[PDB]
Amino acid sequence: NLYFQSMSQRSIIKEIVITPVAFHDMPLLNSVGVHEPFALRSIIEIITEDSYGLGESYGDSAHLDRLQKAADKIKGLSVYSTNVIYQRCVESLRNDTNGDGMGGMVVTASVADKVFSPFEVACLDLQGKLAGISVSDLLGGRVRDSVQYSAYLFYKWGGHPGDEDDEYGPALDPEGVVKQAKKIIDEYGFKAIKLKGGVFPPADEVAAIKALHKAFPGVPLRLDPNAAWTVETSKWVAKELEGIVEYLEDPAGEIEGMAAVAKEASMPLATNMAVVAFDHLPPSILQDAVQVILSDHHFWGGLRKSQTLASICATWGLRLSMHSNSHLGISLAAMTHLASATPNLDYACDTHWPWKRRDEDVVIEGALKWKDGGVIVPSGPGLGVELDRERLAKLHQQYVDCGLKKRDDTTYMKRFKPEFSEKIPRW
């Protein structure tokens, strides 16, 4: 009665702060170029009378402008009013014809869901804090006490041109990839391995996967060339890697390309390109194009919408994994809670954590622990992380200082290899 009435006021959104940040990144290679020296993100803080909630999203300027515009319309709403919040996000894009934020490797996701996602995450953080429960409980309760991640391998230069080598140094052949994988697994203990391909000819990447299978027997392996192959090349790669990889991710482009490959491939095909929005589900399912969908709450519309995708997957007999872009602790907490409370999210989740400096983040240290290749589900109310305001300002200052305004792997590569082509497929 009096509890329900204060709860109505305690749950009203008074203010939203959107803060761009930048953190050091290494020269990781991929199908469209090479990572720039800084990765960008947006940090969303929803502020109520006496509390706040956090979300995290992309850092490019077009996206920040979209977030700010949505945020102006969301103020005054309850953190429980996710239906109307989503409507305001859609409304705010009404006149937006106005880039991925993901290097141009994930171009067809719903903009409204991308814009909605971090508000939805911050709202659930706030719903947890208000009720004194964890976000994983909001999502049906954890079915596992930690969430397993994969070791995400890249070919890479030894350092950014002109600077000294980073602590990993180069990986340009099977031997370098194995050495990277050992360093990473020795630190984290991941129990699954993924290699980012579309960088060398398929024959060479097949060789790195085989070299990894030999060096890490019985550890599930994945290969992701981000649609750098023709259908025939993809069929050849899948033949070579029969019995050797857990799944082959986005070998060829489009639902149609994937479906033609899936017909011959013995391993399941996974995707975060051909299926990246609810609208993509009907045609993919009709064509039996993909067998595993990598969820990503940052572009599927937040934690609850990701659960919906998970249920659609269970209903239609598809499997579910998790996609990552370079990210910080708010995203890691949300990925973990989501995965802990999603029964059929059984494959290990991708993360870029090993690529990020151990001392760069925006959350108070100590809430996110690794153990045996997994993050232990945070135990306090909400996401279980708090905002480190000194560290936010620091990473915001890096943002200001580095002058990067959008992610651009392709332009950065072309500064050193002006002949480089990012078009796919390529082999």
* Chain contacts with Mg ion (rule: CB under 5 A): 224, 249, 272
Backbone angles phi, psi at 411, to 5 degrees: -65, -40
272 contact choice in Mg ion, its own copies, none (CB below 5 to 8 Å, kind-dependent) = Mg ion
Letters for 139-158 (x = contact with its own copies by CB under 8 A, - = none) are -xxxx---------------
Backbone angles phi, psi at 46, to 5 degrees: -95, 130
Backbone angles phi, psi at 171, to 5 degrees: -135, 110
Choice among 323, 337, 356, 406 that is catalytic: 323
Does 76 engage in binding with its own copies (CB under 8 A)? no
Of residues 364 through 393, those in contact with its own copies by CB under 8 A are 380-381
Choice among 63, 196, 337, 352 that is catalytic: 196
CB of 9 to Mg ion, least distance (A): 43
Does 281 engage in binding with its own copies (CB under 8 A)? yes
78 contact choice in its own copies, Mg ion, none (CB below 5 to 8 Å, kind-dependent) = its own copies
Q: Which residue number, 78 or 180, has a Cβ lying nearer to its own copies?
A: 78
The Cα 68–Cα 89 span in angstroms is 10
Burial of 164 (0-12, 13-18, 19+ CB in 10 A): exposed
Does 64 engage in binding with its own copies (CB under 8 A)? no
CB of 123 to Mg ion, least distance (A): 28
The Cα 323–Cα 114 span in angstroms is 14
Strand partners, 148: 374
Does 397 engage in binding with its own copies (CB under 8 A)? no
Q: Does an H or E element contain 293, and which?
A: strand 292-295
Tokens 């996000």 sit on residue: 89
280 annotated active-site: no
3 contact choice in its own copies, Mg ion, none (CB below 5 to 8 Å, kind-dependent) = its own copies
The Cα 319–Cα 179 span in angstroms is 31
Q: Which residue number, 224 or 409, has a Cβ lying nearer to Mg ion?
A: 224
301 token code pair: 């519309």
Which residues, 6 or more positions from 54, have their beta carbon under 8 angstroms from its beta carbon?
A: 43, 44, 45, 46, 121, 122, 125, 330, 363, 383, 385, 387
Does 316 engage in binding with its own copies (CB under 8 A)? yes
Interface residue with its own copies, options 11, 117, 226, 321 (CB under 8 A): 11
The per-residue b/e assignment along 93-117, b for 16 or more CB within 10 angstroms, e otherwise, is beeeeeebbbbbbbeebbbbbbbbb
Is there a contact between 17 and 8 (Cβ–Cβ < 8 Å)?
A: no
CB of 395 to its own copies, least distance (A): 28
323 annotated active-site: yes
Does 4 engage in binding with its own copies (CB under 8 A)? yes
CB of 420 to its own copies, least distance (A): 38
16 contact choice in its own copies, Mg ion, none (CB below 5 to 8 Å, kind-dependent) = none
Other Cβ atoms within 10 Å of 37 Cβ, number: 16
The Cα 374–Cα 348 span in angstroms is 9
Q: Which residue number, 272 or 331, has a Cβ lying nearer to Mg ion?
A: 272
Does 133 engage in binding with its own copies (CB under 8 A)? yes
Q: Which residues bind its own copies (CB under 8 A)?
A: 1, 3-4, 6-7, 11, 78, 80-84, 87, 127, 130-133, 137-138, 140-143, 278-279, 281-282, 285-286, 304, 307-308, 311-312, 314-316, 341, 343, 380-381
Catalytic residues: 196, 323
